[PDB]
């Protein structure tokens, strides 16, 4: 389901090789290695991201995310 | 066969590590890793892509795509 | 041997995970995975590339290229 | 620990295959190859970065970094 | 030592997977495949780069490089 739709206000490369983004005032992270360069490209180029997940509370893991232009 | 032609409406990183793009009203996906950064960049810059595949209805897989600045 | 000098008219991710470019009306492929985001960038920014190989016919494999800002 | 917040002043690919960045007048290195294209991306677009690590002297190793677009 | 300081005039993916750049009249090559996308980016954007090496004569190899903005 759709956890968070907005820009990335920040992203963070973590010690455990995971990647966090803050979207709509909610941090989420992912262990999808290959997602990384993609998220940072979204951030850098002001894309709207939709973070899609089973569990949507601030701090959970994710592996699905849509990229929209806007 | 030329399935779709146009800009990427949106893209989506999928839970099974496949990558989906929407072109001329239809959704297609790839499981070629190397394809993701490539599709993203294309969307970012408004490239015109031609998805080429075996079947062309929405939901189809593809491993072939032409990039134009068209 | 300089097979084709110019700008990339279009680029293609092949079914067989190789990469095709078209330059001064002739098409070339590389199996060099490394070269993809590179070729893609040169197209995006309209660089002059010089493709190089021992055999200069259309749909020949190549493994060397010069990226210029010409 | 927030070791340094600012813009990346320069970056350097090291002989030993680590990667250094200068932020708020201090040098930090990382061995996470994955950070390299992100950090160069952040520099070119003058994002503000926060280097995070256990220890903060100049010439320390780090693997945690926040990317602000702000 | 510092071999050359300036913008990249051209770059070249060699057959052997090495990557050659030309800076201030002098060619150098690296076999660090991670350097490739970083060096193409610096060329596209016109960063000043510093090739650091044990031997500075044109045509020699390097495994260290610094990027600066503008
Ligand atoms: O062999 C490594 C795997 O390919 C892994 O990197 C996945 O891509 C994680 O998303």
Residue numbers in the entry:
A (entry chain A), B (entry chain G), C (entry chain H), D (entry chain J), E (entry chain I): 1 to 70
The authors write:
The pathogenesis of E. coli O157:H7 is in large part due to the production of Shiga toxin (Stx), an AB5 toxin that consists of a ribosomal RNA-cleaving A-subunit surrounded by a pentamer of receptor-binding B subunits. There are two major isoforms, Stx1 and Stx2, which differ dramatically in potency despite having 57% sequence identity. The B-pentamer binds to the glycolipid globotriaosylceramide (Gb3) on the surface of host cells and delivers the A-subunit into the cell. Analytical ultracentrifugation using purified B-subunits demonstrates that Stx2B, the more deadly isoform, shows decreased pentamer stability compared to Stx1B (EC50 = 2.3 µM vs. EC50 = 0.043 µM for Stx1B).
Examination of the structures for potentially destabilizing amino acids in the inter-B-subunit interface revealed a notable difference at position 40 of Stx2B, which corresponds to amino acid 41 in Stx1B. Gln40 in Stx2B lies in an otherwise hydrophobic pocket and closely approaches Leu38 (inset). To test the role of L41/Q40 in B-pentamer stability, we generated the reciprocal point mutants Stx1B-L41Q and Stx2B-Q40L. In contrast, the reciprocal mutant Stx2B-Q40L stabilized the inter-B-subunit interaction to the extent that the pentameric species predominated in sedimentation velocity experiments down to 0.5 µM, the detection limit of the absorbance optics. EC50 values, calculated from the K5 values, were 0.043 and 0.106 µM for Stx1B and Stx2B-Q40L, respectively. CD measurements of the ellipticity at 219 nm as a function of temperature revealed that the Q40L mutation raised the Tm of Stx2B by 18°C relative to wild-type Stx2B, whereas the reciprocal mutation L41Q in Stx1B lowered the Tm by at least 15°C relative to wild-type Stx1B (the unfolding transition for Stx1B was not completed by 95°C and thus could not be determined precisely). X-ray crystallographic studies of Stx2B-Q40L were undertaken to gain better insight into molecular packing at the inter-B-subunit interface. As expected based on the CD data, no global structural changes were observed in an overlay of the Cα traces of a single B-subunit of wild-type Stx2B and Stx2B-Q40L (average RMSD  = 0.37 Å). The leucine in the mutant packs well into the hydrophobic pocket of the adjacent subunit, whereas the wild-type glutamine residue appears to be offset from the groove. This confirmed the CD data indicating that the change in solution behavior was not due to any large-scale structural changes, but rather the destabilizing effect of the unfavorable presence of the polar side-chain of Q40 in an otherwise hydrophobic pocket.
